[PDB]
Design a protein around this ligand. Structure first.
Ligand SMILES: CO[C@@H]1O[C@@H](C)[C@@H](O)[C@@H](O)[C@@H]1O
Ligand SMILES: CO[C@@H]1O[C@@H](C)[C@@H](O)[C@@H](O)[C@@H]1O
Ligand SMILES: CO[C@@H]1O[C@@H](C)[C@@H](O)[C@@H](O)[C@@H]1O
Ligand SMILES: CO[C@@H]1O[C@@H](C)[C@@H](O)[C@@H](O)[C@@H]1O
Ligand SMILES: [Cl-]
Ligand SMILES: [Cl-]
Ligand SMILES: [Mg+2]
Ligand SMILES: [Mg+2]
Lengths: 336, 336
């Protein structure tokens, strides 16, 4: 299945900032000039680098953005703001030999932690040694045999939990045994037969919920039946016909809403109705002609905004206001 | 002027939980049984103790609630959940000699920090030594000379910043010089002539904004004019005739909204219109007959919910749905 090709972050002064791989293999970025849904943008600025994955951005607990990418030497590289929303550090290597997009999250103690597929197809991770600070830990293996980019979320008890496509096409997960801990659970399978990266989110009632493209090209989901613990519900189809990984976000009223690339290469969405954890809507098309997975953020106004690579390789955007019309932010962007 | 008499926390499984002082001077709590605006409440459970302030509750970054109170001995006492949303430790003293409600915030490294007025009218503080865990640091003075209760917020660069009524009845502030620092700036005056505790919130564009009852009994506000920095706007009146401390929250679409006890002992509110930093609305009454400052929280549905001590000395609640009818949560509660 197709993968996400940008990340979006919310700056601490409330503006969205988008990171992509340019046609020159540099990381480029583009941001809203003002904190509002209909805001004009800066246009495209290079952060240089020579990269071969999607960039994954996270906001440090001191509000500096940090971007993680696979370099063309297959090491993990990072670049950070020197102060919130201000200038950038330049590229520093964190070593390793990686084969995926990095996935990033923040621990309860403010330390960033990065998960990758290694060249041995295990899940590997490493972390800041102190809140929002260098230096970083050594690389550590969590074993396994995976084929997806990993996805990571924090549980409602502070424990990170990672979801991957296994070599058997099942969904697998592994979690921290306590908040911030270097001791993880064994690998456990959630079964299923999947054909995308998984997407995970935390419901408002504190349960993780995971979304995948099944072998039948439908969207399927599975969720913790209690906060921060198994058992899981087991697999439920939301139907459709999709060709990307799904992406999921929480609306302002905490209904989940999922975005995919359809078989017709349009953007489609489906949502919980009425309230959080409510019964799901029909599938609805937002049109377009897209060649990536969609990426979704919530803006300062509380409205969802979606970013996609268009058939022309520009970055395009559409927002809750009916949704807005499609709007191009130009650029020449690539998939990895 | 009248103060807040409950504190409210958003638990990690999406339920509101209210703490108050009972007529027996113990701390009591009550919670939504499910994570919905529509939810029935548990009713009051005692946490015992013998207290002479409002309790202040905070959620540790590992999702365990923790409550801070002034004991009858004038010491700072705390009580914590042993697991998220599960059982309570019972009371432990952190010593000191305090004269105010405590105010608690979390640092960027996950360490709770508590701010009090000392017996010497100076601002004092102490902090967890590691993320979300005992032991605590020594008591330390940040000096100054203050009246009533402090208020604390985090800046959009992760620096804590505290606001107090000084003994000259101006608003004063003091901030960490760096995220998680123990080095604070000097005291600075923002002038004014106030007769309540201040309330502080962070706007969606990253600027702190403070609300106070002025000596004229109007609601006044002042804001950082840039993210995380002076100079401030200087004081502007939002008029009205109020007899409590104000409380403020952000709506789903990030319009700030302020709640007060009016001179007619009704609950009144006023909000930013159209968007975050659109012009303020007219004052509007939500009726009721109340004898405290209101306390506001956002529920899992993205809806504001307000708690007040009624004339019957029960706790009452009213919520965004046109607001709901008033609903009694019963109990027998007191101010200190
Ligand atoms: C630190 O170890 C190096 O990088 C890891 C991310 C793995 O790819 C491993 O095979 C390799 O030897
Ligand atoms: C449990 O069902 C299995 O896993 C799901 C994720 C889907 O791929 C379905 O077609 C497959 O048979
Ligand atoms: C505006 O610049 C265009 O888009 C960027 C994202 C890069 O692909 C660059 O090479 C290209 O010319
Ligand atoms: C606009 O109304 C004024 O302010 C409100 C907050 C109330 O105190 C009311 O009695 C007073 O007249
Ligand atoms: Cl299987
Ligand atoms: Cl003592
Ligand atoms: Mg299986
Ligand atoms: Mg003593």
């Amino acid at each position: 299945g197709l993968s996400e090709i940008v990340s979006v972050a919310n700056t601490s002064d409330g503006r969205l900032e988008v990171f992509g791989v340019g046609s020159d293999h540099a990381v480029w970025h583009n941001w809203q000039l003002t904190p509002y849904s209909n805001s004009p943008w800066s246009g495209w600025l290079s952060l240089n680098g020579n990269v071969t994955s999607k960039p994954a951005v996270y906001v440090n607990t001191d509000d500096r953005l940090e971007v993680f990418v696979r370099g063309s030497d297959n090491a993990l590289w990072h670049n950070w703001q020197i102060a919130p929303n201000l200038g950038w550090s330049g590229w520093q290597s964190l070593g390793g030999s990686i084969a995926s997009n990095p996935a990033v999250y923040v621990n309860t103690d403010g330390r960033l932690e990065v998960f990758v597929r290694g060249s041995d197809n295990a899940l590997w991770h490493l972390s800041q040694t102190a809140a929002h600070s260098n230096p970083w830990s050594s690389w550590q293996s969590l074993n396994g045999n995976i084929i997806g980019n990993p996805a990571v979320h924090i549980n409602s008890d502070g424990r990170l939990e990672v979801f991957v496509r296994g070599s058997d096409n099942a969904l697998w997960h592994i979690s921290q045994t306590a908040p911030d801990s270097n001791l993880w659970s064994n690998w456990e399978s959630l079964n299923g037969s999947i054909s995308s990266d998984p997407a995970v989110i935390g419901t408002v009632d504190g349960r993780l919920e995971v979304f995948v493209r099944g072998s039948d090209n439908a969207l399927w989901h599975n969720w913790q039946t209690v906060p921060h613990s198994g058992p899981w519900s087991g697999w439920v189809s939301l139907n459709g016909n999709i060709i990307s990984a799904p992406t999921v976000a929480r609306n302002w009223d905490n209904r989940l809403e999922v975005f995919v690339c359809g078989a017709d290469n349009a953007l489609w969405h489906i949502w919980q109705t009425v309230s959080h954890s409510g019964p799901w809507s029909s599938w609805a098309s937002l049109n377009g002609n897209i060649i990536s997975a969609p990426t979704v953020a919530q803006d300062a106004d509380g409205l969802l905004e979606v970013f996609v690579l268009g058939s022309d390789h520009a970055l395009w955007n559409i927002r809750q206001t009916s949704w807005s019309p499609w709007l191009s932010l130009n650029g020449s962007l690539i998939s990895t």
